[PDB]
Structure formats: C-alpha cells, structure tokens
Amino acid sequence: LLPILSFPDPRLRTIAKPVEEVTDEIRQLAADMFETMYAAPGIGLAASQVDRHIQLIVMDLSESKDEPMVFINPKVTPLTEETQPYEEGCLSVPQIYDKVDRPSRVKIEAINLEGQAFEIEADGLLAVCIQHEMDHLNGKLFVDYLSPLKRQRAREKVEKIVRQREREKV
C-alpha cells in the first residue's frame, strides 16, 4: 500500500510532469495505485496523491474492483457550457464530501498502459472523476471550489482523521 498524501501537504500542490515512455516501472506504479485506491476505498487516484508527480491517473467507477482504467498524459476539453453539480470526495481529503460544479460532457485524450492514444467522450460520473483527477495533476484540490470556512473545517478534520489512522497502527 502506497501512503496517500493528505490535505494540506504542500506536495499535493506540485504540477505533475508528463510520462516520457510507459516503462515497466510505470506499469508496477499504476498497479501499486489501483491497490491503494481499492483499499481506501475509492473510485479515482492521481500519482500526485502518492507523491509521484507524473501524468498518471488510475480509475474504476464499477460497483466491483472489475472495470479498471488508466490515463497517462491526459488532456480534457469541455464539450459544452452545461455544468452538473456532484457530491465529490477525495482520498487526499479523507471523510469530507461537498457539491462541486463542473462541465457535464468533456473529451478525454490520453495514453493507455500499452502506449496507445485514445480519444473518448464522457458524461455523468466519468466526466466528474477525470476533471477531479486532472486537477490533482495541476496541484488543485476539490476543496479549492469550496468557501474557506468549509476548507478550514476540512483542514482541522483531516489532521484529526490522519492522527487516528496513525493511532490505529499502534
């Protein structure tokens, strides 16, 4: 299990560098991230969140651990002005959920774990989740779209949950 960085570790603010080639290390690392992500549990994780500042995103929206998905050097374009609200979470802001307003349909341009490009169009949960993980790659957290009260309540409450994750190891 890779340790997940926790708000407000300033390392979450690092802008990810692009993957140069998909090496066997990038493959192992991506498998490390699926396991971390599935253990939390959670549906999405950026390499930024396990302190590896490269454009690698791991995802699985399925009610099982059965529909894994990889985005390396992603580019996401909104396809419209329409935004949909969604109640977002984050393994790097553990416990806390609020409603964020993001574009509803987006185009995803990325590379897979075999080094092949793909272009997909996304709505619903998928459009929410890549935009959230993209932000991680640009050092942005879903807490940046909430008010500073909501933010500071998250700061103090994550320190609380983190110290307790440690006291459970004891």
> Which residues would be at the binding site for Zn ion (CB under 5 A)?
90
93 or 111, CB closer to Zn ion? 93
Give me the active site residues, please: 133
Per the annotation, does 53 bind a ligand?
no
Residues 6+ apart with CB under 8 A from 103: 78, 79, 80, 81, 82, 83, 127, 131
Per the annotation, does 132 bind a ligand?
yes
Per-state percent for the chain, helix, strand, coil, to nearest 5: 40, 25, 35
25 or 30, CB closer to Zn ion? 30
Smallest separation, CB 115 to Zn ion (Å): 26
3 or 80, CB closer to Zn ion? 3
Hey, what are 33's tokens?
């991230």
Per the annotation, does 129 bind a ligand?
no
Phi and psi torsions of 67, nearest 5°? -120, 60
Binding positions for Fe cation are: 90, 132, 136
